[PDB]
Design a protein around this motif. Structure first.
Motif, PDB file in Angstrom:
ATOM      1  N   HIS B  28      24.328 115.266  25.369  1.00  0.00           N
ATOM      2  CA  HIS B  28      24.232 113.811  25.359  1.00  0.00           C
ATOM      3  C   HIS B  28      25.604 113.148  25.388  1.00  0.00           C
ATOM      4  O   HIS B  28      25.787 112.149  26.089  1.00  0.00           O
ATOM      5  CB  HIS B  28      23.428 113.345  24.146  1.00  0.00           C
ATOM      6  CG  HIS B  28      21.970 113.674  24.233  1.00  0.00           C
ATOM      7  ND1 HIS B  28      21.452 114.881  23.815  1.00  0.00           N
ATOM      8  CD2 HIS B  28      20.921 112.956  24.695  1.00  0.00           C
ATOM      9  CE1 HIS B  28      20.145 114.891  24.016  1.00  0.00           C
ATOM     10  NE2 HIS B  28      19.800 113.734  24.549  1.00  0.00           N
ATOM     11  N   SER B  29      26.590 113.706  24.680  1.00  0.00           N
ATOM     12  CA  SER B  29      27.942 113.165  24.760  1.00  0.00           C
ATOM     13  C   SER B  29      28.607 113.489  26.093  1.00  0.00           C
ATOM     14  O   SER B  29      29.519 112.772  26.514  1.00  0.00           O
ATOM     15  CB  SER B  29      28.793 113.693  23.606  1.00  0.00           C
ATOM     16  OG  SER B  29      30.113 113.185  23.682  1.00  0.00           O
ATOM     17  N   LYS B  32      27.066 110.903  28.372  1.00  0.00           N
ATOM     18  CA  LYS B  32      27.542 109.574  28.011  1.00  0.00           C
ATOM     19  C   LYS B  32      28.823 109.224  28.763  1.00  0.00           C
ATOM     20  O   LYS B  32      29.040 108.062  29.124  1.00  0.00           O
ATOM     21  CB  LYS B  32      27.756 109.506  26.500  1.00  0.00           C
ATOM     22  CG  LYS B  32      28.148 108.148  25.964  1.00  0.00           C
ATOM     23  CD  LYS B  32      28.309 108.185  24.459  1.00  0.00           C
ATOM     24  CE  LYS B  32      28.617 106.807  23.911  1.00  0.00           C
ATOM     25  NZ  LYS B  32      29.955 106.332  24.353  1.00  0.00           N
ATOM     26  N   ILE B  36      25.814 107.110  32.357  1.00  0.00           N
ATOM     27  CA  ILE B  36      24.362 107.013  32.372  1.00  0.00           C
ATOM     28  C   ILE B  36      23.889 105.663  31.833  1.00  0.00           C
ATOM     29  O   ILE B  36      22.751 105.258  32.101  1.00  0.00           O
ATOM     30  CB  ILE B  36      23.779 108.210  31.593  1.00  0.00           C
ATOM     31  CG1 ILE B  36      22.304 108.437  31.912  1.00  0.00           C
ATOM     32  CG2 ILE B  36      23.957 108.031  30.098  1.00  0.00           C
ATOM     33  CD1 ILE B  36      21.776 109.761  31.407  1.00  0.00           C
ATOM     34  N   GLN B  37      24.762 104.930  31.156  1.00  0.00           N
ATOM     35  CA  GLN B  37      24.375 103.628  30.636  1.00  0.00           C
ATOM     36  C   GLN B  37      24.205 102.599  31.749  1.00  0.00           C
ATOM     37  O   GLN B  37      23.452 101.643  31.598  1.00  0.00           O
ATOM     38  CB  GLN B  37      25.416 103.116  29.645  1.00  0.00           C
ATOM     39  CG  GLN B  37      26.036 104.187  28.771  1.00  0.00           C
ATOM     40  CD  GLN B  37      27.265 103.682  28.048  1.00  0.00           C
ATOM     41  OE1 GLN B  37      27.355 102.504  27.704  1.00  0.00           O
ATOM     42  NE2 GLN B  37      28.224 104.571  27.817  1.00  0.00           N
ATOM     43  N   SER B  38      24.898 102.794  32.867  1.00  0.00           N
ATOM     44  CA  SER B  38      24.836 101.846  33.970  1.00  0.00           C
ATOM     45  C   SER B  38      23.566 101.973  34.803  1.00  0.00           C
ATOM     46  O   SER B  38      23.431 101.255  35.800  1.00  0.00           O
ATOM     47  CB  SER B  38      26.056 102.013  34.864  1.00  0.00           C
ATOM     48  OG  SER B  38      26.062 103.288  35.483  1.00  0.00           O
ATOM     49  N   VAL B  41      18.589 100.789  30.521  1.00  0.00           N
ATOM     50  CA  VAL B  41      18.054 101.449  29.339  1.00  0.00           C
ATOM     51  C   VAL B  41      16.798 102.226  29.706  1.00  0.00           C
ATOM     52  O   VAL B  41      16.592 103.352  29.247  1.00  0.00           O
ATOM     53  CB  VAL B  41      17.703 100.434  28.244  1.00  0.00           C
ATOM     54  CG1 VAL B  41      17.564 101.138  26.902  1.00  0.00           C
ATOM     55  CG2 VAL B  41      18.761  99.345  28.178  1.00  0.00           C
ATOM     56  N   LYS B  42      15.949 101.608  30.521  1.00  0.00           N
ATOM     57  CA  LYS B  42      14.720 102.240  30.979  1.00  0.00           C
ATOM     58  C   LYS B  42      15.014 103.446  31.863  1.00  0.00           C
ATOM     59  O   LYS B  42      14.339 104.470  31.783  1.00  0.00           O
ATOM     60  CB  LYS B  42      13.837 101.234  31.716  1.00  0.00           C
ATOM     61  CG  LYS B  42      12.590 101.843  32.340  1.00  0.00           C
ATOM     62  CD  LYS B  42      11.823 102.681  31.330  1.00  0.00           C
ATOM     63  CE  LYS B  42      11.173 101.814  30.264  1.00  0.00           C
ATOM     64  NZ  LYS B  42      10.071 100.985  30.821  1.00  0.00           N
ATOM     65  N   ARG B  44      17.821 105.467  31.987  1.00  0.00           N
ATOM     66  CA  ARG B  44      18.440 106.618  31.344  1.00  0.00           C
ATOM     67  C   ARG B  44      17.432 107.450  30.561  1.00  0.00           C
ATOM     68  O   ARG B  44      17.553 108.677  30.536  1.00  0.00           O
ATOM     69  CB  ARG B  44      19.607 106.184  30.446  1.00  0.00           C
ATOM     70  CG  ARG B  44      19.253 105.340  29.235  1.00  0.00           C
ATOM     71  CD  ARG B  44      20.489 105.032  28.415  1.00  0.00           C
ATOM     72  NE  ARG B  44      21.056 106.238  27.819  1.00  0.00           N
ATOM     73  CZ  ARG B  44      20.660 106.764  26.665  1.00  0.00           C
ATOM     74  NH1 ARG B  44      19.690 106.189  25.970  1.00  0.00           N
ATOM     75  NH2 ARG B  44      21.235 107.863  26.201  1.00  0.00           N
ATOM     76  N   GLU B  45      16.411 106.825  29.964  1.00  0.00           N
ATOM     77  CA  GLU B  45      15.381 107.604  29.287  1.00  0.00           C
ATOM     78  C   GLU B  45      14.522 108.365  30.284  1.00  0.00           C
ATOM     79  O   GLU B  45      14.168 109.526  30.034  1.00  0.00           O
ATOM     80  CB  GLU B  45      14.519 106.696  28.410  1.00  0.00           C
ATOM     81  CG  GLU B  45      13.395 107.415  27.666  1.00  0.00           C
ATOM     82  CD  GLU B  45      13.898 108.405  26.627  1.00  0.00           C
ATOM     83  OE1 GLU B  45      14.989 108.186  26.062  1.00  0.00           O
ATOM     84  OE2 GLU B  45      13.202 109.414  26.387  1.00  0.00           O
ATOM     85  N   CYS B  46      14.220 107.748  31.433  1.00  0.00           N
ATOM     86  CA  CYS B  46      13.513 108.440  32.504  1.00  0.00           C
ATOM     87  C   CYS B  46      14.320 109.615  33.048  1.00  0.00           C
ATOM     88  O   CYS B  46      13.759 110.697  33.273  1.00  0.00           O
ATOM     89  CB  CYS B  46      13.188 107.456  33.625  1.00  0.00           C
ATOM     90  SG  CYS B  46      12.238 108.162  34.983  1.00  0.00           S
ATOM     91  N   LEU B  48      16.758 111.322  31.398  1.00  0.00           N
ATOM     92  CA  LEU B  48      16.847 112.358  30.369  1.00  0.00           C
ATOM     93  C   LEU B  48      15.546 113.136  30.232  1.00  0.00           C
ATOM     94  O   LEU B  48      15.580 114.360  30.057  1.00  0.00           O
ATOM     95  CB  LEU B  48      17.231 111.748  29.020  1.00  0.00           C
ATOM     96  CG  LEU B  48      18.665 111.250  28.837  1.00  0.00           C
ATOM     97  CD1 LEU B  48      18.810 110.551  27.503  1.00  0.00           C
ATOM     98  CD2 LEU B  48      19.647 112.391  28.947  1.00  0.00           C
ATOM     99  N   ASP B  49      14.401 112.454  30.332  1.00  0.00           N
ATOM    100  CA  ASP B  49      13.120 113.150  30.337  1.00  0.00           C
ATOM    101  C   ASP B  49      12.938 114.019  31.575  1.00  0.00           C
ATOM    102  O   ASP B  49      12.371 115.113  31.465  1.00  0.00           O
ATOM    103  CB  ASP B  49      11.984 112.133  30.233  1.00  0.00           C
ATOM    104  CG  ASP B  49      11.976 111.404  28.903  1.00  0.00           C
ATOM    105  OD1 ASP B  49      12.413 111.996  27.895  1.00  0.00           O
ATOM    106  OD2 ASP B  49      11.542 110.233  28.868  1.00  0.00           O
ATOM    107  N   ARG B 101      26.377 113.838  41.930  1.00  0.00           N
ATOM    108  CA  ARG B 101      26.998 112.616  41.430  1.00  0.00           C
ATOM    109  C   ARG B 101      27.094 112.578  39.911  1.00  0.00           C
ATOM    110  O   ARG B 101      27.905 111.819  39.374  1.00  0.00           O
ATOM    111  CB  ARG B 101      26.224 111.405  41.951  1.00  0.00           C
ATOM    112  CG  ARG B 101      26.390 111.183  43.446  1.00  0.00           C
ATOM    113  CD  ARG B 101      25.476 110.087  43.965  1.00  0.00           C
ATOM    114  NE  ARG B 101      25.733 108.808  43.321  1.00  0.00           N
ATOM    115  CZ  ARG B 101      24.870 108.199  42.514  1.00  0.00           C
ATOM    116  NH1 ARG B 101      23.686 108.741  42.270  1.00  0.00           N
ATOM    117  NH2 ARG B 101      25.194 107.041  41.964  1.00  0.00           N
ATOM    118  N   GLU B 103      27.658 115.501  38.381  1.00  0.00           N
ATOM    119  CA  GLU B 103      28.508 116.686  38.229  1.00  0.00           C
ATOM    120  C   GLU B 103      27.810 117.785  37.427  1.00  0.00           C
ATOM    121  O   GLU B 103      28.212 118.150  36.321  1.00  0.00           O
ATOM    122  CB  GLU B 103      29.868 116.314  37.630  1.00  0.00           C
ATOM    123  CG  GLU B 103      30.650 115.427  38.561  1.00  0.00           C
ATOM    124  CD  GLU B 103      31.037 116.154  39.825  1.00  0.00           C
ATOM    125  OE1 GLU B 103      31.393 117.350  39.740  1.00  0.00           O
ATOM    126  OE2 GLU B 103      30.939 115.556  40.909  1.00  0.00           O
TER     127      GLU B 103
END
Lengths: 145, 136, 136, 136, 145, 46
Positions: B28-29, B32, B36-38, B41-42, B44-46, B48-49, B101, B103
């Motif tokens: 996660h770090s 980060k 992934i914040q750009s 919010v919706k 990045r959770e999609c 990560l899942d 993209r 990496e």
């Protein structure tokens, strides 16, 4: 102790104890000191920078309009205190006394296609575009470059 | 002798994903830093899942192919693998060329094998601290 | 082995949020400096409840993704997570770009990971005394 | 004294394939280098299942021909060998000259004998670390 | 120690301790040193490269417009620091001092029919085509070659 | 050994071991030898 043999592409710093002034001695040379003088450390490599890499040196030497190293009247070198300077690929330069190598040889970063960089102006400057980039401005550096 | 039923106890309500033995914090770090914040919010959770479900599918395929036996869809756990593959094959088209993209590799087969830890990671790649920060 | 039912014992009446293991005092004195009083008495309580609910959701997502499995909405606690996500997604639109201006990160994913403590905090950032004042 | 029923316990739902005694990890990292990701996510799983089924058929033919006795289709396991041979002979036509281009041999008989380990591997061939990484 | 017999197709490096300058001595020759001088190591083979093979040597010698090895005024050799150079099949060249052999004798790779190579420009260059290949570009090298 | 300081109105002799040739070094000078070379004796008065 008196005999100093600098290998090719190395340097040292030697302290004039009559003046409290230090300087750099470079080359594939042998060096002979005097009785006042004192070599500070064992000869280290003039640090080199490959292509697609860079480094940042704190407190850079003030150079002239042609890049000749400017000195003080007292033999000391004209630094620029508390700055940084980003050095790109070139010949293995030495480090004059009073210079610290903060960033090592680190690669120039590549931005992929469909990706960009968020860049903030830390301090005011004047870019190559012609714009007075005030400190605090934001940037979009996009492209695959 | 991996936990099989304990995975289905942690099965989500839609089809998305210790039992994995991987640095969670460190990954996660790592993601980060890459921005992934750009993606919202919706978004990045999609994403990560998606990556967690691909990791579970790669763990399943590694478990199967040691005995030899998107295309992955035992009969007793065929339903969960089927709905997980259908969840993968729907939302993958939103992200073309996302593993270069971000990496992680060429495609998802190159990415999940490196993230799982069975395949080597080059020095030109920044994925060396995802298996060694768990070693520290 | 985190307390799960003990969180629902502390569930509020509307959907807003030890069990968190975080410096409360220190975070309130940190946000006192940044100018939260100028948002109105009503406004600062809404913002603090927003940040606490995002912290609980990040703790939940960290608990889930160690086993691999606004978008977050186990079946037994799905109702509280659903109403908490609906409480988050309504009042977040009142505050665009609030985590940079309050000096917590880029967005909420960057902010809650630093405030939870699993991701590094830079020296250029003033968030170093939120985890170390609890160490003193 | 190989496990026979334990293979049919690991029989897949369509006809595709320890019980094999082969470096799985190492073979997957070997095929990762050769560019299996460029065949599509769907394509690489089909190719890996093809190679695993050919490996199981070569193990069966080695088990049979030590006692002397696509063409391979005991009466008690004739059904699984028949459906496996029919699964092989359908999807093989999608891949003409695939064992040279993936650097495994001339054809599948040359490839599976080298990958199984009963036949020598030349120095001009890069298949030396598929049997010796399991020896390390 | 004083007597040095270099076999055919071998070399050594010897250190001038009056100048701190080293150089290479090649040939099927006997070598006699002086009292200042110091041969660094036992004579090693001038490394050779067969056909359909290559190697990469870090820090290559700057050669002139005709390939004559350029030297410093102080007897030292003109390297090109922190580069590489890919060497193809030729006579058994020696390694001048300050050169490291990173890639060994490795074969030139053959691409099969119906197969291609994905190639990325690490640094900007100018290919034989005439195109200014900016760093970051992608390539398709296809063919059975 | 390497450091040779000739007082005013003194001399030494130093042996070039690459040539087996010796010569005199005079003056109120400091002298630095090489590795082949060898000063024969402690500096005596002219």
């Amino acid at each position: 102790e008196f005999i100093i043999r600098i290998p090719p592409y190395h340097y040292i710093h030697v302290l004039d104890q009559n003046s409290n002034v230090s300087r750099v001695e470079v080359g594939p040379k042998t060096y002979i000191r005097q009785d006042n003088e004192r070599v500070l450390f064992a000869p280290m490599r003039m640090v080199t920078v490959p292509p697609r890499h860079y480094c940042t040196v704190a407190n850079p030497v003030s150079r002239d309009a042609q890049g000749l190293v400017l000195f003080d009247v007292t033999g000391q070198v004209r630094l620029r205190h508390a700055d940084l300077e980003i050095r790109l690929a070139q010949d293995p330069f030495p480090l004059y006394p009073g210079e610290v190598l903060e960033k090592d040889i680190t690669p120039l970063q590549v931005v992929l296609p469909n990706t960009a960089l968020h860049l903030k102006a830390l301090l005011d400057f004047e870019d190559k575009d012609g714009d007075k980039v005030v400190a605090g401005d934001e940037w979009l550096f996009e492209g695959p470059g | 002798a991996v936990p099989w039923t304990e995975l289905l106890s942690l099965q989500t309500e839609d089809g998305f994903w210790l039992i994995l033995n991987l640095n969670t914090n460190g990954l996660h770090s790592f993601l980060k830093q890459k921005g992934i914040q750009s993606l919202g919010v919706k978004g990045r959770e999609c994403l990560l899942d998606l990556i967690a479900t691909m990791l579970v599918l790669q763990f399943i395929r590694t478990r199967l192919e040691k005995e030899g036996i998107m295309k992955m869809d035992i009969p007793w756990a065929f339903e969960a693998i089927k709905q997980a593959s259908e969840w993968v094959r729907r939302t993958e088209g939103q992200y073309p060329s996302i593993c270069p993209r971000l990496e992680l590799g060429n495609d998802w087969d190159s990415a999940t094998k490196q993230l799982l830890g069975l395949q080597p990671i080059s020095t030109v790649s920044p994925l060396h601290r995802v298996l060694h920060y768990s070693q520290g």
